[PDB]
A = this chain, B = another copy of it.
Amino acid sequence: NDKLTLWTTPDPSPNCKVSEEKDSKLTLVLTKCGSQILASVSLLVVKGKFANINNETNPGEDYKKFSVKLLFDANGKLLTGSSLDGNYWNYKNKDSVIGSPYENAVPFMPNSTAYPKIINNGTANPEDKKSAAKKTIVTNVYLGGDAGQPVATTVSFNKETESNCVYSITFDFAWNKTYKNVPFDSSSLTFSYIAQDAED
């Protein structure tokens, strides 16, 4: 009933494509403390490529990394082409989701002044040079909650331009370890980014 938490469900049914359709349950919770967004996120791949990682028999790089994209329009609606199905992605209602799909959700989108879409011109003066890293959180999650099973995790904001998105949260994942029969089950990751809002 609180309008201040866009999320999946806390315990979601398969609602995310990783390597196929409905590959994986992605738990993502955006709580809007002031002008910033507090977010935790776990990923669990239940079937397909990364449901039981083995790089002993699959040493290839395509088997040692993947990416999850959330694509949003100017209203901040989740698009098709997002890795995340939008059926069970809405504002909170007890442990579940609100009856109607959400019309507007800009307050929750990354700031397009803080995290601008990169531009396609070559010239750039000292003060007018924009940043790639600014739009980035690089960290680790840990498969199975084992500290010896690190995945390099890269949250990116308004990185994507897919399906004519205006805002884009992107979780990239990669590892060096040659994991043997290790389900991709990520530890919860806490992070924040600066939001947008607009009047009318």
Contacts and interface: CB of A to CB of B under 8 A. Distances in A.
A133 B129 contact: no
Q: Is the interface of A mostly helix, strand, loop or mixed?
A: mixed
A185 B40 CA distance: 25
Interface in A47-86: 47
A66 to B, nearest CB: 14
Given A34-B5, A111-B10, A196-B94, A186 B137 contact: no
A18 to B, nearest CB: 14
Given A47-B126, A145-B136, A154-B147, A193 B188 contact: yes
Interface in A109-148: 111, 113-114, 116, 126-138, 140-147
A136 B188 contact: yes
Nearest to A11: B113
A11 to B, nearest CB: 5
Interface stretch (A25-33, A97-105, A160-168): A25-33
Given A134-B188, A138-B142, A44 B113 contact: no
12 contacts: A25-B129, A29-B35, A29-B36, A33-B33, A42-B131, A42-B134, A46-B129, A46-B130, A132-B145, A133-B188, A138-B141, A190-B192
A9 B154 CA distance: 24
Contact of A46 (B35, B36, B47, B126): B126
Contact of A131 (B40, B142, B185): B185
Contact of A14 (B27, B111, B114, B126): B126
